[PDB]
Amino acid sequence: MMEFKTDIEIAQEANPQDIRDIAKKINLSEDDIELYGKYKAKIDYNVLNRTKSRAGKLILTTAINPTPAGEGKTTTSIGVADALAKLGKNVIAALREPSMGPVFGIKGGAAGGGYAQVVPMEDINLHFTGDMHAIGAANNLLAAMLDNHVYQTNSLNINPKRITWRRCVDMNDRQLRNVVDGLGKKVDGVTREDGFDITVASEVMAAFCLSNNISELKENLGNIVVAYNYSGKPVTARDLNAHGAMAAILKDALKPNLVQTLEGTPAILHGGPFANIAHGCNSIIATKMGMHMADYVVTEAGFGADLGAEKFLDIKCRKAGIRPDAVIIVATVRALKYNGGVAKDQLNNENLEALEKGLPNLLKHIENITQVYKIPAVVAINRFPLDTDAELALVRSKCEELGVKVALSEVWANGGEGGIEVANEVLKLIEEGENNFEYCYEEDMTIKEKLNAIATKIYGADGVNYTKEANKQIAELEELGFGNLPVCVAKTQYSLSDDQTKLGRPTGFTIEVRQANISAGAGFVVVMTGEIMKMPGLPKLPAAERIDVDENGKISGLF
Amino acid sequence: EFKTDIEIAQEANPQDIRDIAKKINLSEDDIELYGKYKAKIDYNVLNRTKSRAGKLILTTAINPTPAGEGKTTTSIGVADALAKLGKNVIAALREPSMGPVFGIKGGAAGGGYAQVVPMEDINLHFTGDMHAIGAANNLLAAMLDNHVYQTNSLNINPKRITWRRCVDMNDRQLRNVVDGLGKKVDGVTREDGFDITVASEVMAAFCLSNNISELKENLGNIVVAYNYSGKPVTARDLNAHGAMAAILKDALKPNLVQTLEGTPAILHGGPFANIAHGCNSIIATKMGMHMADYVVTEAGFGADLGAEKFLDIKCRKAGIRPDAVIIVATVRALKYNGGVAKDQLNNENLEALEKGLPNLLKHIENITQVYKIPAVVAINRFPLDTDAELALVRSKCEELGVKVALSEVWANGGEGGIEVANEVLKLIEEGENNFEYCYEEDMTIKEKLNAIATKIYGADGVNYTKEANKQIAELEELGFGNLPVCVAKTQYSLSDDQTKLGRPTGFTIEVRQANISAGAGFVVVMTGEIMKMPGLPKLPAAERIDVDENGKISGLF
Ligand SMILES: COc1ccc2cc3[n+](cc2c1OC)CCc1cc2c(cc1-3)OCO2
Ligand SMILES: COc1ccc2cc3[n+](cc2c1OC)CCc1cc2c(cc1-3)OCO2
Ligand SMILES: COc1ccc2cc3[n+](cc2c1OC)CCc1cc2c(cc1-3)OCO2
Ligand SMILES: COc1ccc2cc3[n+](cc2c1OC)CCc1cc2c(cc1-3)OCO2
Ligand code: PRO
Ligand code: PRO
Ligand code: PRO
Ligand code: PRO
Ligand code: PRO
Ligand code: PRO
Ligand code: PRO
Ligand code: PRO
Ligand code: PRO
């Protein structure tokens, strides 16, 4: 027979505390909190200026390259945080907010999974506290003011063909990828090519997550480059007098959102940019908030260590002035056997030979964390019942040779109890740890030197090649004065290389850069190794067709 | 003696919204808080409480003039006045669109000392209803295009797609677009456009639904296109309405807010008054009548548009009947109808006041003699209004059997509305159930149009273009001839000619176009061009908007 519980059944049967009690666990009075129902809350960012910082530790959760087998990065983050709570520690989980668009294409999902989730699950997947709407409104206001300026006088001499700013919407709408607007009468605007991204891909989202306060948000938004003039110089949102209004739309959204786990552990969800064209981390203001209110903060970055962790350490940690005390590298035996050449169908059979072929992927990410950034790390293996004792022993052997212990995580089935082993090793790394954190590169280096450093040190590439047009675009960015910013490499996440088919630990390859541009608002240069989907489409049978509401207003079909 | 509306709003002491909910017998478990000054009310509270069967007070006005009339200020003021008189009362109002705030600055819900607070939050995101309306609108658009891109098994003709996308911005750039460009995987190339979010039919259907079940059903009946066989394709055909109602599940809960004097207020919905009915949502008015003894609501654009549609559309679908009608006007506005220039409105001009008074008199006749509802004229008094001017207006209105009450709510708060509120209470106790619609649902579209044009506007009849006739003919064949008609004409005149002030007589209505809003449940009829997406000014008000280091917004008002 069978008997099992889906994540939504686990979320339904939960007993979530009043968010006011959750706030009490981190010394947040009722007068420091804006309630959104009794299970969601927004935290005033002005509590930092009137309370004493606990100077909590920072625990960064990452993973190997994503595989169709799944690794359970966010489930481990929530589970380890719950474990530290079982150990009597004052801990906060810092996570991102999901986009709403994909819920209607491919269905929504739990914050984590199993018994390591964040609740309320339904609200988190939909409107939550409205941050996504605030991001999009600010994005589209700047777009309307840009087009309005060109329509009224165009005194800034904006070249319509060099307009880089794009509108956005929080839906999976392929139809809006490439558009032409401004058609009609003379009074209907100026005809030009345009496009829509999904809201989370907007640069507003990136700068939103890299602002320390509302004044830095207003300053970052003004630095956004929306076009170039006929002289080749950048035209910014500040030049349009737009950043003040955009900061007014985001005034409430910039407050971090307080929720909880299934075990009552305080959780903060805030922001959620891409992990290829952005850094893929939750907001700085939320991570700073947590370290100010708790002794431990468990956060995470998307797409695995070669992308999210690299940008957490080289972009976020630089702009926030923070240092991880420990790093959790998540992996599963099935994912490693997948790197070894096993097809997705056969990942449940024992295959020591394939596990050994795919282990160099985990080994490379360990070397990057512990030998390039010099940060104490622990491997968290999300154990499955078919994981043989030899498979676990082989993984532990090769990881011990690099000085890293392997802790078995069972938070998906046992909640915080299943994360005590990982939590204990993390506390051990924090106490026995020293400040050896090193960036992958220095800011004074050129854009090509920074890319060369990341490709060689992190990806394992022999070097970086540039197309004819990429070299031109990088040369312009150096001339305009952007060569002193961090670089954000937008490449595939399924491989250490830029070739999504090269599993394991590819060697003797080169990265092919074909496009580059400036995200002056977020504060980094974006570099492309291929086409990047900034607006997903809907499948043939969208998930929306099964979503329903009953006479009492209960939603079904979401998960 | 006092300051601007934003300064009055800042110097106000709003109570905790939980205490405001206590005034209308709402427990803490009936209330979702959005800070301690806003709250959403569960619409299931109706299913566990006994209805107080409260009275319905409709607030309308004369045709909007550049002089202003202060309609919403009077509604809030009369609501505060009934509170001063120890009555249990709720003010039901509309939510403002956030878009125009960044063009022509924001404004108060009301004005003077008759406001609704928080003013700042109401002008922006409020509780997110506008975002949900747009999300539901844009999901249906994405699923419509996806179906055509995938299989188009419904044989949708892209040249017959009527659904439009939306955004809550004043963006003239998105009026006419071509989307679907790019690779073969980037969609189907076609012409398209955007409207401001509050102009979506999702907004009108949102406001004409009695419960979450009718919302899902109404959303399903929305016509999004036509197949090559000429038959309507709906959102139900796309299996979208269940998902759209899920996006709106929390939005459909009315928003509990308060006035300056602590009176409970509900702001929910905000459709256009020309291409829609311009009323707050039916659930908000039902909720108020369920939880209180008196409800003051309003309709936009004066009696010939909002009040007409409030009575012939909203009242029909909700099954409610107004117990009294407040017709708001000013001496300045009537003298404007009499031929006085905008700059000369401060001098006494009894001759021009008599030339413009027929406008107010026609609206009285429609309320009291066509719909048969008791009415009272509320004059928002100005300091330079001579006693003779006020006496002339009182004279002509009493010839029709309607008292004139002087309103000073703007400068005096609820005290300034006691005179109006008293006549409203007198009209409710002495009134009878004589309410009649202007037309019956059985009549054809052109008969329903001829009924409104002649009885309400004062026209000799209705003329139709060739294209208007074909569209009306096609709407009859498809089976939409049984719905009400929502006439979209100018608000500055009883006629379809914005220059004909006062009380025009020898005119006829020209219909250029007819469309179907099957989700809202009415047929829209055009007399001219309708701007569903306004543009930003040369100097947008958003350039003056700023935020300080503590997160305080300036320049909004
Ligand atoms: C989202 O992440 C997930 C999602 C799903 C997961 C499912 C399972 N596990 C981790 C998961 C995980 O973490 C890696 C490991 C324990 C387990 C035992 C089982 C089983 C499934 C799983 O089927 C029968 O016995
Ligand atoms: C306890 O065992 C340990 C402890 C510490 C170890 C440290 C390192 N390694 C193994 C270790 C090990 O396993 C043998 C492998 C090579 C290496 C290169 C590096 C580095 C550290 C290490 O920093 C920068 O470059
Ligand atoms: C794969 O199946 C598909 C996929 C997409 C299809 C798209 C269209 N049609 C069949 C399709 C079909 O069936 C053969 C025929 C009706 C039509 C009219 C149009 C149009 C595209 C289509 O663009 C403008 O006017
Ligand atoms: C029943 O009659 C029909 C039925 C189906 C018809 C389908 C199409 N057209 C007329 C039709 C018609 O004419 C009256 C012409 C426009 C068109 C563009 C297209 C397409 C199909 C069609 O596929 C892709 O681009
Ligand atoms: O644009 C300005 O004048 C300043 C610079 C940072 C925030 N606003
Ligand atoms: O000790 C650390 O590494 C972090 C840095 C910011 C405060 N605590
Ligand atoms: O490596 C660097 O340049 C800085 C020093 C503190 C941490 N990272
Ligand atoms: O179908 C689309 O429009 C995109 C591109 C391929 C996968 N999803
Ligand atoms: O109505 C309000 O909310 C304004 C703005 C803050 C103080 N008073
Ligand atoms: O079937 C079609 O026509 C579109 C294009 C690829 C899959 N869906
Ligand atoms: O979707 C694609 O990739 C093909 C190639 C160009 C036209 N469409
Ligand atoms: O209209 C409705 O509500 C249902 C949904 C599927 C078809 N009929
Ligand atoms: O499109 C509009 O609404 C304004 C009016 C003239 C200039 N643009």
Residue numbers in the entry:
A (entry chain B): 0 to 558
B (entry chain A): 2 to 558
Published text:
It catalyzes the synthesis of formyltetrahydrofolic acid from formic acid and tetrahydrofolic acid. Formyltetrahydrofolic acid is then converted through two reactions to 5,10-methylene tetrahydrofolic acid, a metabolite for biosynthesis of pyrimidines and amino acids. PaFtfL exhibits a tetramer in all three crystal structures, consistent with other reported FtfL crystal structures.
In the first type of binding site, named as “active site,” two molecules of BBR occupy the active site of protomers B and D, respectively, in which BBR mainly makes Van der Waals interactions with surrounding residues (T74, N381, F383, P384, W411). Structural comparison among our crystal structures of PaFtfL-BBR, PaFtfL-ATP, and MtFtfL-folate suggests that BBR overlaps with ATP and tetrahydrofolate on binding to FtfL, indicating that BBR likely competes with ATP and tetrahydrofolate to bind FtfL active site. The biochemical assay also showed that the apparent Michaelis constants (Km) of ATP and tetrahydrofolate increased when BBR was added, supporting that BBR inhibits the enzymatic activity of FtfL partially through direct competition. We infer that the binding of BBR at the subunit interface might contribute to its inhibition on PaFtfL catalytic reaction through allosteric effect, and simultaneous binding at both allosteric and active sites explains the potent inhibition of BBR on PaFtfL. In addition, in the third type of binding site, named as “crystal-packing site,” two molecules of BBR locates between two crystal symmetry-related tetramers of FtfL, and thereby we infer that the interaction is not relevant to its inhibitory function.
